[PDB]
């Protein structure tokens, strides 16, 4: 339960076993990675869904199943020159090792002479980001629905010794049913203990990251505070034109809460946007349960949300049968793969 | 439950104990009132939320908690001249004595030389009234959600020997989460038995009030009938241009139900808009349970609604970060309090 009754007891009994089966499992895939699961002829290319720094994302149809995926194609040379080899390699390992309702699923991965291909599940509703910016702000029920899902996602990731390091609306894809799916595990790190890299988006940096003092999984609960605030408010708690000014403001931590924030919402936020890590929720004795048992979460049944059985506030209805319009009617390219294998030993572990 | 199973048995077992702890409690605060709980320097004034006959309502921020309240400020002289001393005094006593999910909370109260201040929780979504008038009419599920909440509010008030005497959409504020909060306890009376005052809004007067024959708590179940009808229909059952004509129509009680009213809705309404009090629901042997167990209420779990754990049909998203726009960008006044204490002995019990 969330607190069914003292069936809260069964909630916790269950969470406990669940997460134990989960470490066993991750550790096996983590420590013995699954590798090169398919090839390009198996997929019809439908349209370009997008275009990036290492290449395109494509809507593809797997020919045996008649199912649709989004294919991220990465040119080896481009990732090598952009010095993204280790981020790429790391994202793939994490992704093929992990398994939760709300993480986006890496369906297949393979390389070929030119390109690395990570075929993921296609989540047509898009990111939370644009919906949030078109709608303006989300009601505290809508915003709590999503909060509940991320708490659970972080409870799981952190048990596998994974700090996500990149929460914001742009990595939270909304699916068919109206539930979150987190994308981009390129800054996640499996770290037991403390680390030192400057990474995220400025807005969501916890004061320790900015301060270069070393940091841990407690950065993700500070970014849940930034996230609930921007969902329920419209805009981030600390934002500025220049990043260094955003930082300016973050290391002071002086937040003004909107008057329509409930006393209750404000007080969850006061302990997630905590600067003292000895007072930050999710980083105290009572771990997540300090967050999970806050009165803003009082009407949330954590098992119902896990089970995907709550009714979603909003389901996106992106327009355009087959090919959409927003996704986009781009100028279609060839995907050329070469007569020779480029970058073989760097991407050898992929 | 509502009727979980014969867990209806536990519903009722529980309601029973709940309400018992509730009388104990009210009686203590009622009979020994809490008094003068704070002072003005404790609050930053943000904006004027509104302006009345005894003075302004202001959005205020309590400086220790960083929380927002709505401050009703009443000029003692104005209440004295408007002969509202006893209504004022009575509203405050009731309010500091009572405690339910759906009643608006009086957070602090104090006076000073000039003014009496009742600081309440700020419920930014506003009244049901305007939403209802902009939307036009509410679906019988939306309208039943609210009905369920008022049934519970009246079950509780009536157990404390309190007849509310002023139901209509303008006192039903919708909060952050989408639940009702009833405001204005200025015509409520703690009456065991029968009373004689002409009070309410014309539209909602039960025939006995109009007839001057004496009346009891059964007037509030007639006003729940007027309320469900105006929510589910758009307009009141009896309305006219002149009040005396509204009365004209009420004491005949001839209502025409809209064709989109369900057979079931019509029949709940036939026994709440009852003129014979020996046939009016909520006033028979089976008290509220005649209402609570009507087939229109059949899909309602009364504990879920109490527990605030149902999902709300509509959550208002009033616009304007901090200060709004609708609430209003008024010409700001001073609140002047005098070198001398005005009306001291009249408001002495406050």
């Amino acid at each position: 339960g969330n607190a069914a009754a003292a069936k809260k007891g069964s909630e916790q009994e269950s969470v406990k076993e669940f997460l134990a089966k989960a470490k066993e499992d991750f550790l096996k895939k983590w420590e013995n990675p699954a590798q090169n699961t398919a090839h390009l002829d198996q997929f019809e290319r439908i349209k370009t869904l997008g275009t990036g720094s290492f290449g395109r994302v494509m809507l593809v149809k797997h020919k045996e199943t008649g199912n649709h995926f989004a294919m991220k194609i990465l040119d080896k040379q481009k990732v090598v020159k952009l010095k993204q080899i280790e981020h790429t390699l790391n994202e793939k390992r994490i992704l093929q090792a992990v398994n939760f309702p709300f993480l986006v699923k890496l369906e297949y991965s393979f390389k070929d002479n030119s390109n690395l291909y990570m075929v993921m599940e296609y989540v047509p509703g898009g990111e939370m980001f644009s919906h949030l910016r078109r709608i303006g702000r989300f009601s505290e029920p809508h915003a709590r629905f999503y909060a509940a899902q991320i708490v659970l996602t972080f409870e799981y990731l952190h048990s596998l010794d994974l700090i996500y390091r990149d929460l914001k609306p742009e990595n939270l894809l909304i699916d068919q049913q109206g539930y979150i799916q987190v994308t981009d595990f390129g800054f996640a790190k499996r770290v037991k203990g403390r680390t030192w890299t400057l990474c995220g988006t400025p807005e969501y940096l916890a004061p320790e990251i900015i301060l270069s003092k070393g940091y841990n999984k407690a950065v993700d609960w500070w970014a849940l505070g930034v996230l609930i605030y921007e969902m329920a408010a419209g805009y981030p708690p600390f934002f500025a034109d220049q990043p260094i000014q955003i930082y300016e403001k973050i290391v002071s931590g002086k937040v003004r809460f909107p008057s329509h924030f409930s006393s209750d919402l404000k007080d969850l936020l006061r302990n997630l946007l905590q600067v003292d890590l000895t007072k930050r929720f999710g980083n105290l004795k009572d771990g997540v349960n300090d967050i999970k048992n806050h009165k803003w979460f009082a009407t949330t049944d954590w098992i119902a949300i896990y089970q995907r059985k709550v009714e979603a506030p909003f389901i996106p209805k992106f327009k355009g049968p087959g090919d959409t319009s927003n996704f986009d009617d781009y100028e279609e390219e060839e995907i050329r793969v070469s007569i020779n294998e480029k970058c073989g030993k760097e991407f050898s572990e992929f | 439950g509502n009727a979980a199973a014969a867990k209806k048995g536990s519903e009722q077992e529980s309601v029973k104990e709940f309400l018992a702890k509730a009388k104990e409690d009210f009686l203590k605060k009622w009979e020994n009132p809490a008094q003068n709980t704070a002072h003005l320097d404790q609050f930053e004034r943000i904006k004027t939320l509104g302006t009345g006959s005894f003075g302004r309502v202001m959005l205020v921020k309590h400086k220790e908690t960083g929380n927002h309240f709505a401050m009703k400020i009443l000029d003692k002289q104005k209440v004295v001249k408007l002969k509202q001393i006893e209504h004022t005094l009575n509203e405050k006593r009731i309010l500091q004595a009572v405690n339910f999910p759906f009643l608006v909370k009086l957070e602090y109260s104090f006076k000073d030389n000039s003014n009496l201040y009742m600081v309440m929780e700020y419920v930014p979504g506003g009244e049901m009234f305007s939403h209802l008038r902009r939307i036009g009419r509410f679906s019988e599920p939306h309208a039943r959600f609210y009905a369920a909440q008022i049934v519970l509010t009246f079950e509780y008030l009536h157990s404390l020997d309190l007849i509310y005497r002023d139901l209509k959409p303008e006192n039903l504020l919708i909060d952050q989460q989408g639940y009702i909060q009833v405001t204005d306890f200025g015509f409520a009376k703690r009456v065991k038995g029968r009373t004689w005052t002409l009070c309410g809004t014309p539209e909602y007067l039960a025939p006995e009030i109009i007839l001057s024959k004496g009346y009891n708590k059964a007037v509030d179940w007639w006003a729940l009938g007027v309320l469900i009808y105006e929510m589910a229909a758009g307009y009141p059952p009896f309305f006219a241009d002149q009040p005396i004509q509204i009365y004209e129509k009420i004491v005949s009680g001839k209502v025409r139900f809209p064709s989109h009213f369900s057979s079931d809705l019509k029949d709940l309404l036939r026994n709440l808009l009852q003129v014979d009090l020996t046939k009016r629901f909520g006033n028979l042997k089976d008290g509220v349970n005649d209402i609570k167990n009507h087939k229109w209420f059949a899909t309602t779990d009364w504990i879920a609604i109490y527990q605030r754990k149902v999902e709300a049909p509509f959550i208002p998203k009033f616009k304007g970060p901090g200060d709004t726009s609708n609430f209003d960008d008024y010409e700001e006044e001073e609140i002047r309090v005098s070198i001398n204490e005005k009306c001291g002995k009249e408001f002495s019990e406050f």
């Binding site: 010095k83 993204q84 742009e170 990474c199 400025p202 034109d241 | -």
Partner: peptide
């Protein structure tokens, strides 16, 4: 209200990540 500030910065669009 800082929301008016918000709109006026360029930071109303897709935010990328400092990095690596």
């Amino acid at each position: 209200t800082t929301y008016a500030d918000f709109i006026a910065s360029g930071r109303t669009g897709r935010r990328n990540a400092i990095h690596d």
